[PDB]
Every structure is written in structure tokens, then in C-alpha cells.
Amino acid sequence: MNIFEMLRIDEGLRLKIYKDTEGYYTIGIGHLLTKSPSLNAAKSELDKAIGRNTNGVITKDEAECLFNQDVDAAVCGILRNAKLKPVYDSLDAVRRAALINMVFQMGETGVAGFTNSLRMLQQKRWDEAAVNLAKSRWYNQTPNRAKRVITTFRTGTWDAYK
Ligand SMILES: *C1=C(C(=O)OC)C(C)(C)N(O)C1(C)C
Ligand SMILES: *C1=C(C(=O)OC)C(C)(C)N(O)C1(C)C
């Protein structure tokens, strides 16, 4: 198991534009296209991301291509953020993947706002951090996925993904 296999489980794979759990146009392995309600706006975003006129459908190879860029962008966002980089640097590789997972789902700024959870992770107070992380809109709106990510933070193992 690794961050790619982890997010592939959490995000799925769909080759046509669909609406994500928030109602936002998405494609591939959780590639958010736009929060705009305009399907043409989402299709324009898709064409720009792929470099061709797609009419809202991509191939599996294209989906995996976007996914690799998106995982990279999540890591890049963490390492440039003054709030997230210290926590990331302090973590083992499995818990690092859990933080990347959260940034992939909610964005750099969103995760960087989890000030008290981040402190608890930095302190390596894993059970306490797990309790705090669940006190969130994130957990309430996607509880099964959040439970898996939180278990990964709590234990430092892949138990929730096997
Ligand atoms: C990845 C791609 C790919 O692997 O599909 C063959 C394309 C669509 C060529 N490219 O735009 C990226 C780099 C996104
Ligand atoms: C890092 C980036 C990156 O390396 O994506 C793979 C982008 C998204 C260009 N950038 O905004 C940071 C600095 C976060």
C-alpha cells in the first residue's frame, strides 16, 4: 500500500464527468474540475487539463496521468505551507500519506486550518488527534472515508485499507 493505492480506493475511477460528494464536477480519480454549476465551465477546465477537446470523457491512462499530477500538487502544497510542512516533516511515511489524503480531498488551506489537530499530530498524541479530527464538517460529510484516514493517523498502519 502507498498514497496512490490509498487515494485510488478513496476516490474511485470514473471516465466521464460526474458530480463529487459536494456536488462539484469531477473526473478520473477525484480530479476536481470546478465548483461552478456550469457543465460547460467544467468541460473547459477538462480540455485545458488534458490539452485536447474532450467533450467530457477521458481514457484510463489520462485519468492516471491527472492523478499523478494531483498527488504531486498535494505534496507540493504541504511542503510550501508554513503550517503543514512542520507536521509533515515530523510524521512517519504512513501518516504522511494520511495528511496527503486530506490535502487531496479538501485543499491545502482547508487542512492548514485544522490548527488543534495539527498540534496533536505534531505532539504524537495519536488517540487525542483522532478524536479531534472527527469533530469536523469533513468527518460528518464523508464519515467512512474520514474514519479510514483517521485510523491511519491513529495507528500508523494501513489497517483501514486492507
Ligand atoms: C497525461 C497524459 C496521458 O498519460 O495520457 C496518455 C496526457 C493526456 C497526454 N497528458 O495531458 C497528461 C500529462 C495529463
Ligand atoms: C507545487 C506545485 C507542484 O509541484 O505541482 C506538482 C504547484 C501546484 C505548481 N504549486 O502551486 C506548488 C508550489 C504548490
From TrEMBL:
Catalyzed reactions per annotation: Hydrolysis of (1->4)-beta-linkages between N-acetylmuramic acid and N-acetyl-D-glucosamine residues in a peptidoglycan and between N-acetyl-D-glucosamine residues in chitodextrins
Entry keyword annotation includes Hydrolase: yes
The organism's place on the tree of life at top rank: Viruses
Biological process according to GO: cell wall macromolecule catabolic process; defense response to bacterium; peptidoglycan catabolic process; viral release from host cell by cytolysis
Keywords: Antimicrobial, Bacteriolytic enzyme, Cytolysis, Glycosidase, Host cell lysis by virus, Host cytoplasm, Hydrolase, Viral release from host cell
EC number annotated for this UniProt entry: 3.2.1.17
Gene Ontology CC annotations of this record: host cell cytoplasm
Principal location listed in the UniProt entry: host cell
Active site: E11, D20
InterPro entries referenced in this protein's UniProt entry, alphabetically: Endolysin_T4_type, Glyco_hydro_24, Lysozyme-like_dom_sf, Lysozyme_dom_sf, Phage_lysozyme-like, T4-type_lysozyme
Pfam family, one: Phage_lysozyme
Recorded GO MF terms: lysozyme activity
Signal peptide: none
Localization per record: Host cytoplasm
Record-linked CDD domains: T4-like_lys
Job description of the protein: Endolysin with lysozyme activity that degrades host peptidoglycans and participates with the holin and spanin proteins in the sequential events which lead to the programmed host cell lysis releasing the mature viral particles. Once the holin has permeabilized the host cell membrane, the endolysin can reach the periplasm and break down the peptidoglycan layer.
Similarity comment text for this entry: Belongs to the glycosyl hydrolase 24 family.
PANTHER family xrefs: T4-TYPE LYSOZYME 1-RELATED (PTHR37406)
Protein's UniProt name: Endolysin
Gene, per the UniProt record: e
